[PDB]
Amino acid sequence: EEDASQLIFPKEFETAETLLNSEVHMLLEHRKQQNESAEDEQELSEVFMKTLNYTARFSRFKNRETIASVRSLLLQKKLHKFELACLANLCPETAEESKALIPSLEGRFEDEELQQILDDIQTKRS
Amino acid sequence: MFYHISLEHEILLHPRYFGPNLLNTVKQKLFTEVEGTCTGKYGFVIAVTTIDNIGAGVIQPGRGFVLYPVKYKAIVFRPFKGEVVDAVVTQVNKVGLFTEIGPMSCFISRHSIPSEMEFDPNSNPPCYKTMDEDIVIQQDDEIRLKIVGTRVDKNDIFAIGSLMDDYLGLV
Amino acid sequence: XXXXXXXXINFKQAEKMMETMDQGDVIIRPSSKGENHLTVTWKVSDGIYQHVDVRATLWINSEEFEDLDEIVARYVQPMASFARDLLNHKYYQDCSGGDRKKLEELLIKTKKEKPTFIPYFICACKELPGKFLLGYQPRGKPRIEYVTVTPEGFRYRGQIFPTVNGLFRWFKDHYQDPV
Amino acid sequence: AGTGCFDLLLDAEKCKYGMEIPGATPAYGAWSPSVGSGMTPGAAGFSPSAASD
Amino acid sequence: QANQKRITTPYMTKYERARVLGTRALQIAMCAPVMVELEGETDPLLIAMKELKARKIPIIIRRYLPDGSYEDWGVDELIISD
Amino acid sequence: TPTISLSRKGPSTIQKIKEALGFMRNQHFEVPFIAFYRKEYVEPELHINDLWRVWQWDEKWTQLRIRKENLTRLFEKMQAYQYEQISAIRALDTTDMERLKDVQSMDELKDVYNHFLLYYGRDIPKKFGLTPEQFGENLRDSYQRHETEQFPAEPLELAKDTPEAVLEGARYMVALQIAREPLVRQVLRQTFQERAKLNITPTKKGRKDVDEAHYAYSFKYLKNKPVKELRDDQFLKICLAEDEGLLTTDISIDLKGTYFEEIKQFYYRDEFSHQVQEWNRQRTMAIERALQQFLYVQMAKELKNKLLAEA
Question: What is the rounded CA–CA span in Å between residue F216 and residue F239?
Answer without folding.
Answer: 7
